[PDB]
Design an enzyme around this catalytic site. Structure first.
Site, PDB file in Angstrom:
ATOM      1  N   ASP A  98       0.804  -1.226   0.000  1.00 51.29           N
ATOM      2  CA  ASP A  98       0.000   0.000   0.000  1.00 51.29           C
ATOM      3  C   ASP A  98       0.831   1.267   0.000  1.00 51.29           C
ATOM      4  OD1 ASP A  98      -2.551  -1.597   0.416  1.00 51.29           O
ATOM      5  OD2 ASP A  98      -1.604  -2.015   2.345  1.00 51.29           O
TER       6      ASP A  98
ATOM      7  N   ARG B  47      -8.009   3.805 -14.240  1.00 53.48           N
ATOM      8  CA  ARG B  47      -8.580   4.437 -13.046  1.00 53.48           C
ATOM      9  C   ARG B  47      -8.512   5.968 -12.998  1.00 53.48           C
ATOM     10  NH1 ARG B  47      -6.904   0.046  -8.264  1.00 53.48           N
ATOM     11  NH2 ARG B  47      -7.579  -1.795  -9.478  1.00 53.48           N
TER      12      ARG B  47
ATOM     13  N   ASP C  90      -5.634   7.776  -4.210  1.00 54.50           N
ATOM     14  CA  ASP C  90      -6.723   6.877  -3.836  1.00 54.50           C
ATOM     15  C   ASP C  90      -7.669   7.556  -2.870  1.00 54.50           C
ATOM     16  OD1 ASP C  90      -6.051   4.668  -5.360  1.00 54.50           O
ATOM     17  OD2 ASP C  90      -4.894   3.712  -3.767  1.00 54.50           O
TER      18      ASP C  90
ATOM     19  N   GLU D 218       2.153   1.600  -6.437  1.00 51.01           N
ATOM     20  CA  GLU D 218       0.761   1.767  -6.050  1.00 51.01           C
ATOM     21  C   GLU D 218       0.154   2.974  -6.766  1.00 51.01           C
ATOM     22  OE1 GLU D 218      -2.204   1.291  -4.587  1.00 51.01           O
ATOM     23  OE2 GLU D 218      -1.574  -0.795  -4.759  1.00 51.01           O
TER      24      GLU D 218
ATOM     25  N   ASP E  98       0.899   4.002  -1.508  1.00 51.38           N
ATOM     26  CA  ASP E  98       0.227   5.075  -2.249  1.00 51.38           C
ATOM     27  C   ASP E  98       0.954   6.399  -2.146  1.00 51.38           C
ATOM     28  OD1 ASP E  98      -2.027   3.745  -3.140  1.00 51.38           O
ATOM     29  OD2 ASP E  98      -3.077   4.120  -1.238  1.00 51.38           O
TER      30      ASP E  98
HETATM   31 CA   LIG Z   1      -3.751   1.676  -2.439  1.00 51.10          CA
END
Ligand SMILES: [Ca+2]
Length: 352
Positions: A129, A218, A170, A166, A131
């Site tokens: 993770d 995305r 988000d 990542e 990010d």
């Molecule tokens: Ca993430």
């Protein structure tokens, strides 16, 4: 003021009583936010004790350049990030010109957070993770004038073969109102969620004046809620753009699409297709697809593409106030207003 040109209404820590601090490193940012929770008696205050405006002057170019040269060695490293957890007095993390970071900003259960003029790239910890910017359970957040980058590439043998790097931005949980503007995002495979799961639906998010280049997917991956995307410049999208899912609604206006595969879709669920309202983009009818190199693909399961380039639903009255420039002006001028070192400059009709 509290105007962000989007759903988020915040001044961040740029309010009355704000304490200005300078951070030279990632660790200073951490020590600064920590000290800001203590009152005049050295006792913790829920939500923070006072507002903060942190100017980050650190530079981690050596880490970034080292990572840029060994792209596949990043995913297995420890992730690095500053956590802004449960801080509601108001906070602004702004980068000084020339600054850079090889660590991310993770916002959790906070509110009124503004992140500006930050250059973050090639982050480690893609499998854990890592990010660049995470907005979780955090309303009134403004992510503005940042440059977020990595490599739009997937190495071999990475967990789920989707963890080389990542995401850039988000958003998930109760992050009810967010504005993502003037960011220069490039070389990113997974740009950012807007709902972490089928059940994590909702939120009102605005994406405006962002410059996307060489991104795979995305833009965002929307799970329900509302998304207003205006004045963005989308180019070199190698997979899909706005993926409207779980009956989410989107207003896509005055943007510029070029060299993009599946710019506006609703795929991967096979059901509960979202809707979109198209208006004033550079593309107006299917004829323009060939003109701007727009290609479409199908999916193994039931999907909906915007190949007819028609509006498939409605959208509520856009609450806030905003003045979009034409699609051409974005294409011509946006690259000079998006990103770091632009002194937070905005694109207006007069500038067109
Ligand atoms: Ca993430």
């Amino acid at each position: 003021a509290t105007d962000t040109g989007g759903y988020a209404a915040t001044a961040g820590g740029n309010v009355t009583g704000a304490v200005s601090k300078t951070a030279t490193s990632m660790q200073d940012i951490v020590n600064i936010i920590d000290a800001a929770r203590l009152d005049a008696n050295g006792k913790k205050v829920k939500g923070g004790a006072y507002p903060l405006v942190i100017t980050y002057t650190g530079n981690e170019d050596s880490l970034i350049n080292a990572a840029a040269a060994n792209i596949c060695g990043q995913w297995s490293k420890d992730p690095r990030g500053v956590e802004i957890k449960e801080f509601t007095k108001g906070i602004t993390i702004i980068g000084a010109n020339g600054s850079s970071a090889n660590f991310g900003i993770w916002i959790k259960k906070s509110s009124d957070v503004v992140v500006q003029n930050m250059r973050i790239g090639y982050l480690p910890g893609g499998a854990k993770d890592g990010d660049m910017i995470r907005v979780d359970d955090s309303p009134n957040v403004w992510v503005d004038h940042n440059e977020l980058f990595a490599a739009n590439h997937e190495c071999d043998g990475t967990p789920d073969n989707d963890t080389t790097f990542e995401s850039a931005v988000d958003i998930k949980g109760a992050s009810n109102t967010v504005t993502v503007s003037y960011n220069y995002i490039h070389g990113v495979k997974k740009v950012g969620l807007d709902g972490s799961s089928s059940s994590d639906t909702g939120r009102n998010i605005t994406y405006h004046h962002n410059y996307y280049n060489d991104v795979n997917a995305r833009l965002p991956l929307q799970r329900g809620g509302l998304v207003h995307a205006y004045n963005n410049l989308y180019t070199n999208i190698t997979g899909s753009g706005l993926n409207v899912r779980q009956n989410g609604q989107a207003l896509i206006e005055n943007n510029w699409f070029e060299k993009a595969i599946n710019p506006v879709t609703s795929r991967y669920d096979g059901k509960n297709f979202g809707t979109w309202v198209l208006k004033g983009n550079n593309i107006t009818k299917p004829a323009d697809f060939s003109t701007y190199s727009i290609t479409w693909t199908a999916d193994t399961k039931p999907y909906v593409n915007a190949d007819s380039w028609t509006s498939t639903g409605t959208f509520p009255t856009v609450a806030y106030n905003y003045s979009p420039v034409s699609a051409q002006c974005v294409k011509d001028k946006l690259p000079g207003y998006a990103g770091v070192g632009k002194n937070l400059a905005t694109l207006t009709s007069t500038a067109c």
